[PDB]
Design a protein around this ligand. Structure first.
Ligand SMILES: *C\C=C(C)/C=C/C=C(C)/C=C/C1=C(C)CCCC1(C)C
Ligand SMILES: CCCCCCCC/C=C\CCCCCCCC(=O)O
Ligand SMILES: CCCCCCCC/C=C\CCCCCCCC(=O)O
Ligand SMILES: CCCCCCCC/C=C\CCCCCCCC(=O)O
Ligand SMILES: CCCCCCCC/C=C\CCCCCCCC(=O)O
Ligand SMILES: CCCCCCCC/C=C\CCCCCCCC(=O)O
Ligand SMILES: [Cl-]
Ligand SMILES: [Cl-]
Length: 264
């Protein structure tokens, strides 16, 4: 149903994509080890954010590793090209973990803005419905990327409506609670908002590729625009989120954060 099914692939295209997804995995999982080790320097009130991206990290990673294995499963070298065999490849599984990856990554931002009690609980709820809202209509959207490009654009459309509002909630929360944040991180927090704007735009480009580049190199650039997107929203976004919690932990009198900071 997907444009990955439509083309035969050069060995350079096939090996590049396999190498892309595998470099992927090395990185969610090596970042897995570092957010484990530093979690001990984070004060009780922030420690679930670090834990949180140890879940974003093992989630993409499994989609990611599952994608590389399905990729090699699906295609074999026949008469000079990689050709589709008995099993299919698709990106529909990256969507269901988008449903997944997101609660956490908005949850982990909210933990560091010092939301608590009823504002945390109600802000998260609206944030997971809205983002899930974006996830499921473009997942619904993407399924017609061969059969109905007009369905692409219109769910594309209905997904973009959600994104913008999601971004409006987050935006509002960040700029409203800037004042509560410690240790200089009120300037830091606004780099995160921007860093997270770039990552999440790469995904509708990444998704308009069947519309504007329905060929095998488009398939490549899709997967490419994914590794950036990914390493930035899960991985790079992640490390950003973890510096803030340690810095705030230190300004709150949490001694291990203070020794950890001073050590470097
Ligand atoms: C895993 C982390 C993140 C931040 C997931 C990001 C996905 C999006 C920002 C998807 C956006 C889409 C829209 C707005 C338009 C085409 C339909 C999509 C769901 C593919
Ligand atoms: C900011 C995170 C960066 C993510 C790293 C992605 C690395 C890809 C780097 C560019 C590779 C240039 C190689 C071009 C591939 C040749 C295309 C082909 O084989 O047909
Ligand atoms: C599967 C082939 C090999 C894949 C593994 C790649 C090797 C490791 C990659 C680099 C790790 C980058 C992640 C950042 C670690 C954060 C800790 C720190 O930066 O101080
Ligand atoms: C892969 C490595 C296995 C151990 C991973 C990290 C150990 C963390 C130890 C700790 O700080 O509690
Ligand atoms: C909540 C769901 C939000 C509204 C979805 C309505 C618009 C999408 C309909 C496209 C279906 C079609 O082309 O037949
Ligand atoms: C060229 C490459 C661009 C830079 C790569 C990004 C690095 C990892 C995230 C850094 C997180 C730290 C942000 C706060 C640092 C600080 O305020 O001192
Ligand atoms: Cl605490
Ligand atoms: Cl994912």
């Amino acid at each position: 149903k997907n444009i990955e099914s439509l083309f035969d692939y050069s060995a350079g295209q096939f090996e590049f994509i396999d190498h892309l997804l595998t470099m992927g995995v090395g990185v969610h999982f090596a970042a897995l080890i570092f957010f484990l080790v530093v979690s001990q320097f984070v004060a009780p009130k922030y420690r679930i954010a670090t834990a949180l991206s140890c879940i974003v990290m093992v989630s993409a990673g499994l989609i990611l590793n599952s994608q590389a294995v399905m990729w090699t499963d699906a295609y074999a070298y026949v008469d000079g090209s990689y050709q589709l065999q008995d099993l299919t490849f698709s990106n529909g599984y990256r969507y269901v973990n988008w449903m997944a990856t997101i609660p956490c990554l908005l949850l982990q931002l909210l933990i560091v803005l010092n939301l608590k009690g009823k504002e945390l609980f109600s802000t998260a709820t609206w944030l997971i419905l809205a983002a899930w809202g974006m996830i499921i209509t473009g997942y619904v959207g993407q399924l017609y990327e061969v059969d109905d490009i007009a369905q692409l654009m219109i769910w594309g459309a209905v997904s973009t409506a959600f994104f913008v509002v999601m971004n409006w909630i987050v935006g509002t929360k960040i700029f409203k609670n800037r004042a509560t944040m410690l240790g200089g991180t009120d300037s830091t927090i606004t780099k995160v908002f921007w860093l997270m704007m770039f990552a999440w735009t790469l995904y509708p480009i990444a998704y308009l590729v069947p519309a504007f580049m329905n060929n095998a190199d488009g398939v490549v650039l899709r997967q490419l625009l994914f590794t950036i997107a990914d390493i930035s929203s899960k991985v790079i976004y992640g490390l950003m989120i973890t510096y803030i919690a340690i810095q705030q932990s230190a300004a709150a009198g949490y001694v291990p954060a203070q020794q950890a900071l001073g050590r470097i």
